[PDB]
Amino acid sequence: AFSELLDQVGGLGRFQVLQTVALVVPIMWLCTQSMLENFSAAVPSHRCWVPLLDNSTAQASVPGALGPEALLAVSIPPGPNQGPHQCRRFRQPQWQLLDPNATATNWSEAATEPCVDGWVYDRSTFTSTIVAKWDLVCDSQALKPMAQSIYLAGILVGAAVCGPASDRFGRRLVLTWSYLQMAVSGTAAAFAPTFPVYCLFRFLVAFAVAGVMMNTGTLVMEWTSAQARPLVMTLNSLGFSFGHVLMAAVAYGVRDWALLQLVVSVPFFLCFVYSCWLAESARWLLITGRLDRGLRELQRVAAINGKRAVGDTLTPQVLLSAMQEELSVGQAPASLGTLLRTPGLRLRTCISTLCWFAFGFTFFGLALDLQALGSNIFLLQVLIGVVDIPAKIGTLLLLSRLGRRPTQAASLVLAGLCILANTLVPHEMGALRSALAVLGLGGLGAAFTCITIYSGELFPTVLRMTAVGLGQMAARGGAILGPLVRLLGVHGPWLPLLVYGTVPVLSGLAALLLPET
Numbered sequence: 001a002f003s004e005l006l007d008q009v010g011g012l013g014r015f016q017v018l019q020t021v022a023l024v025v026p027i028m029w030l031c032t033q034s035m036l037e038n039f040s041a042a043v044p045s046h047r048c049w050v051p052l053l054d055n056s057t058a059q060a061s062v063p064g065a066l067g068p069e070a071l072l073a074v075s076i077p078p079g080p081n082q083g084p085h086q087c088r089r090f091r092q093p094q095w096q097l098l099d100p101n102a103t104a105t106n107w108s109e110a111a112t113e114p115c116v117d118g119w120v121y122d123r124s125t126f127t128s129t130i131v132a133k134w135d136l137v138c139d140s141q142a143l144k145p146m147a148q149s150i151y152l153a154g155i156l157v158g159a160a161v162c163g164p165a166s167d168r169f170g171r172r173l174v175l176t177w178s179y180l181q182m183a184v185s186g187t188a189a190a191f192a193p194t195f196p197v198y199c200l201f202r203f204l205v206a207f208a209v210a211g212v213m214m215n216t217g218t219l220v221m222e223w224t225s226a227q228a229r230p231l232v233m234t235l236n237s238l239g240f241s242f243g244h245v246l247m248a249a250v251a252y253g254v255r256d257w258a259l260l261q262l263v264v265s266v267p268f269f270l271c272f273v274y275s276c277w278l279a280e281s282a283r284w285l286l287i288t289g290r291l292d293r294g295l296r297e298l299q300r301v302a303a304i305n306g307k308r309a310v311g312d313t314l315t316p317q318v319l320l321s322a323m324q325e326e327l328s329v330g331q332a333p334a335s336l337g338t339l340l341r342t343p344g345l346r347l348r349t350c351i352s353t354l355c356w357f358a359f360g361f362t363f364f365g366l367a368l369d370l371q372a373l374g375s376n377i378f379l380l381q382v383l384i385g386v387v388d389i390p391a392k393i394g395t396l397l398l399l400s401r402l403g404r405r406p407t408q409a410a411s412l413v414l415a416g417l418c419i420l421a422n423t424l425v426p427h428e429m430g431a432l433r434s435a436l437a438v439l440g441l442g443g444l445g446a447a448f449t450c451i452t453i454y455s456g457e458l459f460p461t462v463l464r465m466t467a468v469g470l471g472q473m474a475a476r477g478g479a480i481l482g483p484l485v486r487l488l489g490v491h492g493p494w495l496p497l498l499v500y501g502t503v504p505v506l507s508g509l510a511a512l513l514l515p516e517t
């Protein structure tokens, strides 16, 4: 098997460290790409465009000066939920509301009119956003979630198209192409003049994100020992956790959505540049039937590891003899039908995927709309990343010490309970709300590594990959379904959070059924 070749060549040497660092670095920026939506697509307060305020001629026509606060009351109906109406304007100016008495029900909807001239957004915190540019407000409010869904749709498509491709052309080639596609698509989306064009380039960016993620995952775990695999994943996950901290650093500097996207998607040009000086997986070359390339790559890895003589001793005969087990009897991937045929495994599978979905649905429903969780988004963005790392290390320590099943159940249950508690406390006590939201997101980050490590060992080795793929697809499908739930928020902001908090609790409670180890 290739394990003998890896042992002969290395496994935990200089080359592994260098390649791991190089592959880990881009995941921060990949996280930034996904988490862009919070700052690029922020929704500011949108008053209606009123002639008597913006047009200076009309305002100056009246003798004397009238305060903006008092002048607004004559041309904007008092809106629902304690604010000036964000989608209606008075048909004619009304001075009754001004001087003597205040009309609660008199400012009825009969005299109102839709925003014919457009809206006037607030630029105090964000210079520009996608919502302001294309007026994704009032009747078009549903467009913002949909767009997000479309982005998360691309992730579902990319993994469905970059998987069979990576097994035909090679992992590193597809990874390089994905870096280039990311850079180009981001730069194009920065300049999108129309809304469908921006959505299309966002879909392409999601495609490239999926390709990069899967190729990196396959590359790191094919050049390292099987004993270090549990550790490797964490190094990848922790890298993503740093993106949060980076995002808040970038968003706090540039407040224009176009410049934000351009800054985010530029480094991937450098990533594509240095992608050339990387290592193609020797396992794929050897099993596919390309022995010259595999031998040269293995000798290169041996030279980097510092053992030139050992690398030189390798010959085609030894390589063929060592790899006969995998090549002589080709292990074709066990069909999903075969995995679902066995009565014994069914209970294990149905629960397992149920966890994946529960994580994917709940995370992307809460992460992308971070405004509802707290008061300001910069502090929440920083704190999510700051708290994920201790959580993601404590989960590994508990898995080593405590059983996997209790940890898997507890993480999901606590995350769901934290979200449920967060949605109940009054908005006045912002500190409690923010802390509970941060802790829930941290618990979800913990559950990610817990389930990723655990699901591998549940099923036999023959059908393990099929089960992992099924779980990953379930996570992506729940991710697509996540944002659409926010449309229910019209009935009230509490319902989406109630759903997002209820799903993880049930998933965690069900996770107790599946066996330990």
Ligand SMILES: CCc1oc2ccccc2c1C(=O)c1cc(Br)c(O)c(Br)c1
Pocket: 030, 031, 034, 155, 209, 210, 213, 236, 237, 240, 241, 360, 363, 444, 445, 448, 475, 476, 479
């Ligand atoms: C469903 C698979 C998927 O595709 C993405 C594309 C961009 C950003 C995140 C993801 C993502 C995740 O769910 C995810 C969540 C956490 Br937490 C991680 O630490 C890592 Br690594 C990945």
